[PDB]
């Protein structure tokens, strides 16, 4: 009742992908803000960040202060990740939303067995990450992700702007064309907060039981 129609969203995603071909991340964020601004938590587009660094958060706040950003609090997070989330909420001009599943960790352990991540990690991710993310994305017309094509060989064709079929709405990846050197230089130039575990030999940060230890 507060999202654009699916054909309208598909046409908007097509036009955005065609017009923003080879554009910078700030240009894509400006286009997203101009297209989904009104009709500062009265915004119609949200940003998703795993709280590994405040690059995308800083960019979105510089293009749109008070922008909302969601963080999927699966309950299995590192204490450093929650600390980084709180620090980003305090420093940057961003409205943070802690998306939590309807069932806590103890409730899920009681209902389907303790340590579901060990027995069915796909179902654990679907219950604590995918379903709450979908329930939160209802009402927004577009979402912004910090996905980079260098994350995996299967992500090499990650589109700049597209229509996410899983959640059925516009998906924008400003950091797609970015490389490791690019994010490094940006981190340097803007003095943006970084999760402390990244310094302690952790390329990617996720849930504590499902993160590869060095
Ligand atoms: N726990 C999370 N909480 C909030 N956003 C996330 C989370 N995980 C991934 N995202 C989104 O997914 C991107 C990275 O995906 P991945 O390659 O699975 O780590 C991030 O830049 C965000 O756009
Ligand atoms: S990363 Fe592991 S603990 Fe976190 S939701 Fe997915 S399966 Fe569960």
Curated annotation (Swiss-Prot):
Protein biosynthesis is among the record's keywords: no
Gene Ontology terms describing biological process: cysteine biosynthetic process; hydrogen sulfide biosynthetic process; sulfate assimilation, phosphoadenylyl sulfate reduction by phosphoadenylyl-sulfate reductase (thioredoxin)
Root EC class: oxidoreductase
Alphabetized Gene3D superfamilies for the sequence: HUPs
Record: residues binding [4Fe-4S] cluster: 124-125, 207, 210
Locations listed in the record: Cytoplasm
Secretion signal, residue range per the UniProt entry: none
UniProt cofactor note: Binds 1 [4Fe-4S] cluster per subunit.
Catalyzed chemical reaction(s): [thioredoxin]-disulfide + sulfite + AMP + 2 H(+) = adenosine 5'-phosphosulfate + [thioredoxin]-dithiol
A GO cellular component entry from the record: cytoplasm
Matches recorded under HAMAP family: CysH (MF_00063)
Role, per record: Catalyzes the formation of sulfite from adenosine 5'-phosphosulfate (APS) using thioredoxin as an electron donor.
Name listed for the protein in its UniProt record: Adenosine 5'-phosphosulfate reductase
């Amino acid at each position: 009742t507060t999202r654009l129609t699916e054909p309208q969203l598909r046409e908007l995603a097509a036009r955005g992908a065609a017009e923003l071909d080879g554009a910078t991340a700030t240009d894509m964020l400006r286009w997203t803000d101009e297209t989904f601004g009104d009709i500062w938590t009265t915004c119609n587009y949200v940003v998703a960040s795993n709280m590994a660094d405040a690059v995308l958060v800083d960019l979105a706040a510089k293009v749109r202060p008070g922008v909302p950003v969601i963080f999927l609090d699966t309950g299995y997070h590192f204490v450093e990740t929650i600390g980084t989330r709180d620090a980003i909420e305090s420093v940057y001009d961003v409205r943070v939303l802690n998306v939590t599943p309807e069932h806590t960790v103890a409730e899920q352990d009681e209902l389907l067995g303790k340590d579901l991540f060990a027995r069915n990690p796909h179902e654990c991710c679907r219950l604590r990450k995918v379903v709450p993310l979908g329930k939160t994305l209802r009402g927004y017309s577009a979402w912004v992700t910090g996905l980079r094509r260098v994350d995996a060989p299967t992500r090499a064709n990650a589109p700049l702007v597209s229509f996410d079929e899983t959640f059925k709405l516009v998906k924008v990846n400003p950091l797609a064309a970015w490389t490791d050197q690019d994010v490094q230089e940006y981190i340097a130039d803007n003095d943006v907060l970084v999760n402390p575990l990244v310094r302690e030999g952790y390329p990617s940060i996720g849930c504590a039981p499902c993160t590869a230890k060095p």
